[PDB]
C-alpha cells in the first residue's frame, strides 16, 4: 500500500517536470565544477589550458653558448593530423613559418607529453657545383632523388 500510494502521488507530467528541474540543477552544478577545478583529460588541452599560443620558446646548445629561439603556431585555428602540431604553411619556407627537426621534435614531445612528427632533416651535403652567368649552382641528393639550388 505504501508503494501504491507513492506511485499514484502525482500525474506523469508533474513527475517529468520535477525530474527535469533536478536534472537541470545537477547538470548546472556539474558544469560549475568543471569550469573552476579543471578536467581529468588534460591531454586534449580543452580550453582552460595554454600552449595554444602562437609562439613557443626552446633552447639548444651551440659551440660554447646556450641560445634560445621561437617556434610558431596557428594560435588555435585548425589542426594537422599528419604532423600532430599546429603548423602553418609548413610546406613553404618564409618568415613566420614553422619548421621542426628531430633535434627539437623530441624535446617538444617531452614538453607536451604527446608524440609529434618532424617534417624534414636538419641538413644535407652538397656533392657538385656548377657556375653559370655569375651564379653558382649547388646539387645534392634528397631521399634518393637529385635536387639543386
Amino acid at each position: 500500500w505504501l508503494i501504491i500510494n507513492l506511485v499514484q502521488m502525482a500525474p506523469i507530467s508533474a513527475m517529468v517536470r520535477m525530474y527535469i528541474f533536478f536534472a537541470s540543477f545537477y547538470y548546472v552544478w556539474k558544469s560549475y565544477v568543471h569550469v573552476v577545478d579543471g578536467c581529468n583529460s588534460s591531454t586534449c588541452m580543452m580550453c582552460y589550458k595554454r600552449n595554444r599560443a602562437t609562439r613557443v620558446e626552446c633552447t639548444t646548445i651551440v659551440n660554447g653558448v646556450r641560445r634560445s629561439f621561437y617556434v610558431y603556431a596557428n594560435g588555435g585555428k585548425g589542426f594537422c593530423k599528419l604532423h600532430n602540431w599546429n603548423c602553418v604553411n609548413c610546406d613553404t619556407f618564409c618568415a613566420g613559418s614553422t619548421f621542426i627537426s628531430d633535434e627539437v621534435a623530441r624535446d617538444l614531445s617531452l614538453q607536451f607529453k604527446r608524440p609529434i612528427n618532424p617534417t624534414d632533416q636538419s641538413s644535407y651535403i652538397v656533392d657538385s657545383v656548377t657556375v653559370k652567368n655569375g651564379s653558382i649552382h649547388l646539387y645534392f641528393d634528397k631521399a634518393g632523388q637529385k635536387t639543386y639550388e
Partner: protein, 50 residues
C-alpha cells in the same frame, strides 16, 4: 532606479567567499523554498503535520 537584486547577489557572493561547513544546509533550505514555491499544491493533501 532600484538595485535590491544586486545587493542580494553581493550578499550571496560574500557568503560564498566565507565558506564553512554549514553553507550547504542554507543552500538546501533555499532550494527547498524555491521548489516548494514553484509547484506546491500537487502533493499536499491531508496530514496536517505535513
Amino acid at each position: 532606479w532600484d538595485l535590491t537584486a544586486f545587493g542580494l547577489v553581493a550578499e550571496w557572493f560574500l557568503a560564498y567567499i566565507l565558506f564553512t561547513r554549514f553553507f550547504y544546509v542554507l543552500g538546501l533550505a533555499a532550494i527547498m523554498q524555491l521548489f516548494f514555491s514553484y509547484f506546491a499544491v500537487h502533493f499536499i493533501s491531508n496530514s496536517w503535520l505535513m
